[PDB]
Amino acid sequence: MKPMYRSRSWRRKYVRTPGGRVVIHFERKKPKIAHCAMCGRPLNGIPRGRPVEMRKLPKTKKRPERPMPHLCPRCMRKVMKEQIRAQ
Amino acid sequence: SGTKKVGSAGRFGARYGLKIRRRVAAVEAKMRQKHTCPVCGRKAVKRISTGIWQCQKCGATFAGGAYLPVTPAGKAVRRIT
Amino acid sequence: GKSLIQQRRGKGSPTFKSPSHRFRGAVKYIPLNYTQEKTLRGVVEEIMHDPGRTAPVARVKFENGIEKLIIAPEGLLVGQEIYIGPDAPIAVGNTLPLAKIPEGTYVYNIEGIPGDGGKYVRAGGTYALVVSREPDKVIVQLPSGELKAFNPMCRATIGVVAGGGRLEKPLVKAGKAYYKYKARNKFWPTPRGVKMNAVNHPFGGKEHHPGKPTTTSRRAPPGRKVGHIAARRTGRRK
Amino acid sequence: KKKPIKGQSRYRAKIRHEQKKKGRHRGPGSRKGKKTARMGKKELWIKTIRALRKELRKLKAQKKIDRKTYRMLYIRAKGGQFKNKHQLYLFLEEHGLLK
Amino acid sequence: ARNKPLAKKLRLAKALKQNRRVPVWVIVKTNRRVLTHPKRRYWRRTKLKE
Amino acid sequence: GSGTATFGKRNSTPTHIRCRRCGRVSYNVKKGYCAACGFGRSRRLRKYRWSKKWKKKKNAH
RNA sequence: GCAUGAAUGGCGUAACGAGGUCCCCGCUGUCCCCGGCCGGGGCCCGGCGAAACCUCUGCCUGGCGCGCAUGCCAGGGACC
RNA sequence: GGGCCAGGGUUCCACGGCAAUGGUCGUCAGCCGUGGGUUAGUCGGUCCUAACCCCGCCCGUAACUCGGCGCGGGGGAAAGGGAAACGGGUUUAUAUUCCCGUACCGCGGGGGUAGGUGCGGCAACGCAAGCCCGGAGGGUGACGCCUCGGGGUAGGCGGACCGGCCGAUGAGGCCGGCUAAGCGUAUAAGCCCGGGGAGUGCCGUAAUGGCGAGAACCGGGUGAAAGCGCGAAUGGCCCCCCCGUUAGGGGGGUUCCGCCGAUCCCUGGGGCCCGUGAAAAGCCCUCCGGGAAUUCCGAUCCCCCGCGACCGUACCGAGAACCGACACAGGUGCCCCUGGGUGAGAAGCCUAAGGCGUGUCGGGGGAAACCCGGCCGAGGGAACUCGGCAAACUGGCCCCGUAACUUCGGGAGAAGGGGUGCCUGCGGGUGCGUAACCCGCAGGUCGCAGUGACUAGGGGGGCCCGACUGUUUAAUAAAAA
RNA sequence: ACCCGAAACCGGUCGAUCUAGCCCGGGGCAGGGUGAAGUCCCUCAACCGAGGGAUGGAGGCCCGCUAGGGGUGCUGAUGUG
Ligand SMILES: [Zn+2]
Ligand SMILES: [Zn+2]
Ligand SMILES: [Zn+2]
C-alpha cells in the first residue's frame, strides 16, 4: 500500500467485491465522545462522528433539549441552584 | 505475597545490591499504601503523578510529597498557620 | 588542543540547548500593579506535572479574568480559592508582601526585587524561613543556610513547595537516569577528563592520573577551570 | 483455456483428526510444546470460574440453596477450593447444604 | 518518481526530445561529415545533469 | 562499512537542485541558498577572485 | 614485598560474561594412520576472451668478483 | 509471490530488425529503427501548524553577501492534523480519472415546510424546532508505555444439496455455489434518570473492587464496530445445447446448517513514571450584543436546477529499470500483507495460489593427481597442539530428583534417573452436544532404533579481572578498556 | 632562474544523502518460559499455632536462524574477489 496508508491513523478493512476481487478499504477513525466541562464525565444526546457526519444531521439531533447542554445533569442542576440562590 | 525480604524489589531479581533494593522496597511499600483523604476522611488516596495525589472516592486531588502525601515541612507549616 | 564540554555548551548548539517547548511555561507572578494596594481572589483549576520543573504546577483563574500558572505548594487542593495582595489572609497558597508575613513563617518563590516575578525557593520540597522584619528590610533564611535581606515590598507565597523527598528513592537503572536527563536535555552520560587524550583535557594522558593539583585558580582563563575551582579546602572534614 | 487448480487434498488429515478424536496420536512422544502452551493457564481459570459462578447463580434461582449458602460458596469459588462443578456438588452433598 | 513538479517534468521532457539520432537527410546533405551530436544519451549509462 | 555498502544510501532527498537564477544544479535545498551564485542568501552574485569558474563561462581566463 | 596498600581506593563478594587461565566425566579421524564415497573445480571438446609481469637471455661443480653468478675462468653434461 | 514510496525519466505499448550491447549463441531483449501511450469536484500537492528557517526595523562591525536580542510580517510535513465515490465494463499500452449504473461534499438559485407565533416526558432525554452580522465559552480535532476481559469481521475447517473433472462410468478426491460505496435501521461496555431504603451484611469481576457521600432490586435514556433491507442481478462465476468455412445464438443454476477465528476493527477494565507522552487549521453546541420580519420574513427539513480552476497520474519499484564505474552475491525497502499438513510457533520440511527455469555459457567422462563443501570409518580415546582449533557428545516434551554458595531474589533446565511409536476400548475438564480444544487410564502389537525425518542445551570443579544490561577503534584490537 | 619530486604553512569558500550528537513528526519487534508487588480462600485447634490451595502479571528477566540488529572463532572461502 501507499506510504500514506501505511500510517495507523487509517483503519483498513478487507472486502470482497461483487466481481470477486478482494480490495482494501481505508477509513478515518471516529472522534471520541463529548465530556462534561466541569467533572469530565461523558455527555448524553451528543452523537459521535467526524465533521461530515455531524453536518449531515439537523440541529436538534446533536444535543439535548435542556439548558446548558455542555454539562451533565448533576452539574446543570447544581449550577442553576447556585445561580438562583445567589440572585 | 510470601517473600521474606525483597518485597516490591523482587522484580530486580539478583541485581542492584542489597542497600539499593532495600531502599526501593521500603519507599515503594510506604508510597503504595492507602492514605487518608483530607476532604472526605477515608483511606482511598492514591498517587497519580510525582507529587500529585487523588482520592478514589470523592475525587479530590491535591499536591503533596514525591512519595508521601504529606512531608514534615508541610506538617510544620500547617500547624504553624 | 580541542574544546571542553563547558566550552562547547556556550555556543548554544542543539546538543546543549534546553527543549523549552515540552514545558508548560514560566511561573511568574501577575504584574505588581494588580497585586499592590489591591487583593485578588483566584480559583485553582488544575494541578499537573511539569516535565522540567522538579515541582508540580497549578493553573489559577483570578476574578479579573487573568489566568496564570504557579508552583503548587504542598497540600494545595484543586477547586480551592487563594488570595494575592497585601490583605490576603495568612494561609498556604497566599501571596503577599514580606512586610505582612509574620516571623517564623515558611515561604517560597520570593521576589528578588519588587515585581521581578520570583527567583528564590522554587525547587521541589524547598522553603525559606522569615527571621526578622524591619521598616527597610526583611531577613529570610534560604534553603542553602544563608540569611538574605529582601525589600519589604517583595512578594512571597506561604507554604512549602510540593514534591519533597524526591531523592529518597534510588535511580536504580542507567535507563532511569537516561530518561531523567533526556527529559531536560542534560549532557548524559558524562566522560572523565582523566581518561581523555592530552589534547582534550588538562588531566588527559596515557596514564589515568592528574599530572597537576586539581585545585585551579579563580584567575585561570577559560578552557582551564576544571576540577575544584577556587576551592577553600578539599577532602573530608574529619 | 483456463486450466483448473490442482487443489490440495485433506483426506489423510481428516482421517488423522478422527483418530485423534478417538484418542490416538496424543501420547508423550507426539508433544512438542509445553503443557501450559498446550492448555493455557488464565484461559483455563476463566473457563472454570465462570462455570462455577453460572452454576451457583442457577442453584440460587432454582432455590436449592439460600442466600447465605450462595455467598459462602461464592467466596469459596473465588478462593479456588473447587476445581470443577463435580467437586462443587460433592461438597454440597457432603455438607448437606443442598435442599 | 510518482509525484513530480511541472518545471522538472518540462526539463526532463526537453532532455527526452533532445535524445535522438541525426537525420539521414542531414547526413547526406553534409556528406557524412556530421554523423552525431554531443547530446546522445543512454538512460542506464549516462544520467541527466538534474 | 565506509565503502561500497555506504553508497547505497544515496536514495534520500538530493542535497542540491537546480537554481532559478544561475541555472546550475547547486541550490542547497535544505538550507535554501545556492552554492555557486549565492541565490537566496545575497542579492549580488557570489563571485570570488580565487575562482576561475565564472571566467570559464565567457572564455575570459 | 628488587619495586603492595586504603576514593589514581584496600579487602571480599552472590548473579552475570562470544574476557584470561588450570583440572575432571562424556565425546569424538586432533593424533597412532590414514582409507573409501558424494556434489563443484581441475582435465578434454565448441564459443567469448583479458590482466599482473617483461633490459636481452635463461644447465651445472670449484672458483675470481661490490665478498651468495643461467651469461666471467677451468672443467662436466646437454638431439628438438 | 502481491501493493507501493524515495531514486531513475521513457526504460512502458505495438510493428519491423540483429552492424554493435547481452560473460556463449540468438530469429530474443530494459538493445537499434518507426509510430504511439499518462484524461480527477472526491486520490495526493494546494489549507493548518510542529522542530526550524527567511525578510523589514533595531544594535555591532572599518565594512559587508557578516554576528545578533526585541517588535512586525512570511515560510516550513506528498507517511502529523485535514469536506466529499464506490461496483461493472473498456484499450496493444490510462484508469477510484474514460463509458454505463448508483452516490457524496462546497458555492449560488428556485418551489414548499419547521419555526418568528410548537410540543411529549418527574427526569435522563425525544424532537425538522426561525434569518443575518460581530464576540465569548464548552466539546472535538488531541495523543505515552505495559497488561487483560467483552463484542465483531476477514480468512479457514467438517456435513447436506446442485453443476462439472478425474476414478472401475467402484469407494473416494478436487473445482464454482458471488455481492461495493451510499441510504434507513439497534444494541453491548461506559455514563446517566426515577423508584428503593441495607450491616449475625449483602452485590460483583479474569483480576483490582462498590455501598447512608446511597447497596441489593424493579423500570428506563444516551450510546461503537457489526448484522439486516434497497443498491442487486439486468451484474460477476460455473455448466449445458444448436449453429462451426469464417463469423454466432439460446438455456440452467448460483441454495443451507455446525465449528475454529485473527497481528484486522469497536469498546471497557487495571498497572508504571525522579520518564508525563505536540500545536494550529477546521468542525459541533451554548450564551451573550446588534440588524430586518406581519395580507410579512424564513431554515441545519424534503424536491429540483447551475457551477466546481492549476499541477502529478506510463513503467520498474530491484540477485537486470535506484546508489555503488557493471544486466555488481553489497546497500537502499522487507517499507505494508500472507492458504493446507506437521507442529507452541511468522521455526524446519512438504505442498496449493502466484512466479520462475535469466541468482543465464554448454557438451564429454569411473577422465586421473590435487583443491574446496559434505557422509561414514575397526582397536585406543587428546598420546596431537601454544591451546580439545575444528569436529564430536547432549538436545523437544512428561514425571521423579537437585549441591557448595548466597545480596534470600537466585544458583536451576544445577547435577542425575525413568518414559515417548502405532492399534482396540474407557474415564475426565469447559461445553446444549456423539461440535471444537485439552487431560488421564487399561489392553494388544512391531522394529536395532518411536522428540525415528525436520526441529532440538554437552556437563562439573578451582583461580584472576570487571558488579550487572549497555558502548568502543566503519577497514587486523569487543577486552580486564 | 637548467628541468622535475616533498611532507607541510596561510587566505576565502563547500560539505551532517556516509557517519557523531540533539530536536519535531512517524513505522516495527512469531512463539514460549519464569512468576514481583497487590488481592485472597480452605482444614484442625485456639494460651500460642500448624497444614494446603488459588488468583495477578513486574522485570534495561530467560530460551528463541520471527522480523530487525551485531560481528566471537574457523585466523574457513575469496584475496587481478
Ligand atoms: Zn459534570
Ligand atoms: Zn476523599
Ligand atoms: Zn545559483
Task: Write a structural description.
The structure is cut from a larger assembly and holds chains A (87 residues), B (81 residues), C (238 residues), D (99 residues), E (50 residues) and F (61 residues). Chain A is α+β, with helices and mostly antiparallel strands and 87 residues long. Chain A has two helices and two strands. Chain B has a four-stranded antiparallel β-sheet, with no helix packed on it. Chain B has helices at 18-31, 72-80; strands at residues 35-36, 43-49, 52-55, 61-63. Chain B has 81 residues and is α+β, with helices and mostly antiparallel strands. In chain B, a hairpin with a 2-residue loop joins β2 and β3. A six-stranded antiparallel β-sheet of chain C has the order 5-10-6-7-8-9, with no helix packed on it. In chain C, strands 3-2-1-4 form a four-stranded antiparallel β-sheet, with no helix packed on it. Chain C has a two-stranded parallel sheet with strand order 11-12. Chain C is built from three helices and twelve strands. In chain C, 26% of the residues are buried. Chain C has helices at 5-9, 32-35, 174-182; strands spanning 40-49, 56-62, 67-71, 81-84, 95-97, 106-108, 128-134, 137-141, 147-150, 155-158, 215-216, 228-229. The interface between B and C is medium-sized, with 31 and 36 residues. The complex binds zinc ion (ZN) (3 copies). One zinc ion binds at residues 36, 38-39, 41, 71-72, 74-75 of chain A. Chain A binds three RNA strands through β1, β2 and α1.
Throw out a few tags for this protein.
part of a larger assembly, 6 chains, E: 50 residues, mainly alpha, F: 61 residues, mainly beta, 3-stranded antiparallel β-sheet, binds zinc ion, RNA-binding
Largest sheet of chain F: 3 strands, antiparallel
How would you sum up the global shape of chain F?
A: extended
What class would the helix/strand composition of chain A place it in?
Answer: alpha+beta
The distinct ligands, each listed once, are: zinc ion
Secondary-structure element sequence of chain F? EEEH
Helix content of chain F: under 10%
Helix content of chain A: 10-25%
Computed structural class of chain F: mainly beta
Radius of gyration of chain A: 21 Å
Number of alpha- plus pi-helical segments of chain F: 1
Main beta sheet of chain A: strand number and arrangement? 2 strands, antiparallel
Sequence of strands across the biggest β-sheet of chain F: 1-2-3
Radius of gyration of chain F: 15 Å
